């Protein structure tokens with residue numbers, strides 16, 4: 226299988242290296258020379274334009290920063306692609322943008338999936354990414370052998386856009402949970418309840434979630450959590466802020482009522498102005514900026 | 518070790534808790550000022566008394582299961598002088614941290630041992646003896662108390678000094694309230710986006726957002742057939758009770774000067790929902806997010 230990989234950034238570079246390692250012919254494009262060089266070092270044939278990368282490909286994967294860039298990439302390359310080429314967008318973009326680009330690709334007789342990922346650069350390098358996939362079951366089946374070498378998990382979420390929707394809903398819940406957990410630890414400390422005692426109680430009770438059992442925002446109870454390593458990501462505030470921006474777009478576009486999600490979105494937007502480079506669990510230390 | 522226990526408060530939680538103590542071979546001396554409550558407890562073997570001071574007079578252990586801090590304080594004031602010196606008082610009521618520490622000090626000033634030991638599990642947990650006791654007070658006192666708590670309990674966890682049981686419960690339940698609202702928001706947003714309830718359920722439960730509020734208390738019918746959404750939102754854990762716990766969380770927040778932006782938002786949402794939907798499971802808050 227020949228794969229054109231468009232977007233060879235912090236995620237795209239290690240993803241494409243895993244595809245090379247699984248026996249695929251990988252063709253590539255990135256507008257950053259440092260990204261392109263790094264990708265060529267691990268076996269990707271890099272081209273000067275995306276239409277060139279796509280010309281001989283059975284599969285075209287996009288990993289790009291915004292819906293606008295994904296859409297422009299599609300209109301740039303679709304005429305260059307061969308018929309029934311499989312397009313996989315693994316960018317994280319809005320549900321609306323995902324569906325528009327899916328419809329565009331299928332208008333050209335391509336097969337298309339949205340397949341955004343969770344797991345970050347670490348997951349990308351380790352080939353343990355979780356792909357949340359929207360599109361046809363038969364298209365996903367065809368895509369599976371390409372996805373497998375990048376993936377720890379592959380989940381079919383529904384029709385086009387469902388992958389983006391599922392990821393955005395989960396990460397909105399996560400953001401709320403990470404703040405709620407942080408509030409709980411600060412309240413406990415002011416009440417004279419130790420961090421370890423609260424940890425032991427919450428992890429054995431109804432409040433338990435990844436935000437505490439793995440991402441515990443106070444040092445000690447989970448030695449590997451970012452709180453014990455100066456809040457090094459992990460999962461950066463910058464990226465959580467980005468996902469919440471998309472959750473808010475989804476909320477605006479549907480007219481949905483999401484008071485805690487929107488409050489979390491506000492909290493992380495403000496926090497990202499100062500601490501974008503910290504793990505999102507570091508929000509524990511910005512709660513007194515909220516003080517009224 | 519078989520003991521004489523006074524049980525003050527024989528309501529929805531108190532009655533089944535006391536029945537398990539009788540079943541374990543303890544002599545249980547009960548009082549409740551609602552005769553209906555007392556009648557039910559008597560039917561399962563509790564010796565019911567005319568007054569709280571009478572029930573307390575010959576007890577090694579005194580358990581209170583009462584609705585508010587005010588009622589606990591009132592009870593302690595009426596009974597502490599009647600109890601034998603160095604009687605062990607366990608308050609399994611859910612009351613504010615401040616109230617718990619006040620009544621703990623009151624008990625100790627009268628020469629009594631005292632623990633706060635609020636419980637989770639509701640009436641079903643109470644009947645099955647699978648309650649979780651979250652305990653605050655002295656380690657040795659808890660040691661003394663264990664044989665009494667064991668026949669009512671699935672879990673006994675020591676949380677710290679007096680008040681820490683209440684603190685741990687109120688922190689956990691604040692988080693829960695926030696999570697239940699957030700899960701409801703996700704499911705409604707998913708529906709407006711064309712993502713099926715089953716699909717969202719499968720994703721969140723396999724991902725970082727998983728929590729009891731979704732995996733056990735899923736607010737949409739279908740993915741978890743045992744959840745309240747499939748049974749007309751019959752509790753479960755009532756909105757009335759969650760609103761009570763959120764009131765206590767807001768008391769703790771006010772007393773400490775903590776900032777809890779989402780916990781306080783969740784308290785405001787549940788306070789409004791409880792006005793007309795007190796009798797529904799707290800997952801029913803999902804109704805507020807739909808038009």
Ligand SMILES: C[C@@H](CCC(=O)O)C(=O)O
Nearest residue numbers: 373374375376377378379
């Ligand atoms: C187990 C995984 C296969 C892909 C991989 O593990 O590389 C999956 O089925 O998603």
Ligand SMILES: C[C@@H](CCC(=O)O)C(=O)O
Nearest residue numbers: 646667668670671672673
């Ligand atoms: C829960 C308590 C034992 C009592 C019981 O299972 O009823 C314990 O395991 O500490």
